[PDB]
Amino acid sequence: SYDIQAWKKQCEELLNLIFQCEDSEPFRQPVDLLEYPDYRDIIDTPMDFATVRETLEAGNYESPMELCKDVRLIFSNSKAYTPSKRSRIYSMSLRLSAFFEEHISSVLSDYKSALRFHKRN
Ligand SMILES: COCCNC(=O)N1CCN(C(=O)c2cccs2)CC1
C-alpha cells in the first residue's frame, strides 16, 4: 500500500471525525484571553484543530508526523493549563487524545512504509 500522498486525505477524514465529536468542543478554535486572562502566561504555543486543518489544507505540512506533533500540542497545552486532573475540559482532552492516537497509528505506519518502499533501490 505504497502511496506516499495518501496520508493527507486520511488526515482530512480523521479531522472530520474529530469535528463530529462533542469531546472536541473546547479544542476547535483559540482560547479567548477575556475568558482565560492568564492563558498565555502558561501556554507559549497555542494550537487548535481549526489551525491544524488550515495548515493541512494550505499545504504547510510535509508529513503526517508534523500534523501529529501539532495535534499532540493541543493535548499537552490542556494538561499544562488544567488546575486539576479531574477538570471537565482536561477530561475531554484525554478521551479525544485516545481516539486520535487509535486512528493516527495506521496513517503513520502506512506513510513510513511508503517512504521506505520509495527509497528501496
Ligand atoms: C469552546 O471552546 C472555546 C475555546 N477553547 C477554550 O477556551 N479553552 C480550551 C483550552 N483550555 C483548557 O484545556 C483548559 C481549561 C480548564 C482546564 S484545561 C482552556 C479553555
UniProtKB/Swiss-Prot annotation:
| Tissues of expression | Expressed in myeloma and epidermoid carcinoma cell lines.
| Localization (cell) | Nucleus
> Which segments constitute the Bromo domain?
2-107
* Taxonomy, superkingdom: Eukaryota
Phosphoserine (modified residue): where? S1, S91
Q: List modified residues, type Phosphothreonine.
A: T45
Linked disorder reads:
Chung-Jansen syndrome: An autosomal dominant disorder characterized by developmental delay, intellectual disability, autistic features, anxiety, hypotonia, obesity, and dysmorphic features.
* The protein's role, per its UniProt record: Probable regulator of the insulin and insulin-like growth factor signaling pathways. Stimulates cell proliferation through regulation of cyclin transcription and has an anti-apoptotic activity through AKT1 phosphorylation and activation. Plays a role in the regulation of cell morphology and cytoskeletal organization.
- Quaternary state and partners of this protein? Interacts with IRS1 and IRS2. Interacts (via bromo domain) with acetylated lysine residues on histone H1.4, histone H3 and H4 (in vitro).
UniProt-recorded name of the protein = PH-interacting protein
Q: What lineage, starting at the top, does this entry show? A: Eukaryota, Metazoa, Chordata, Craniata, Vertebrata
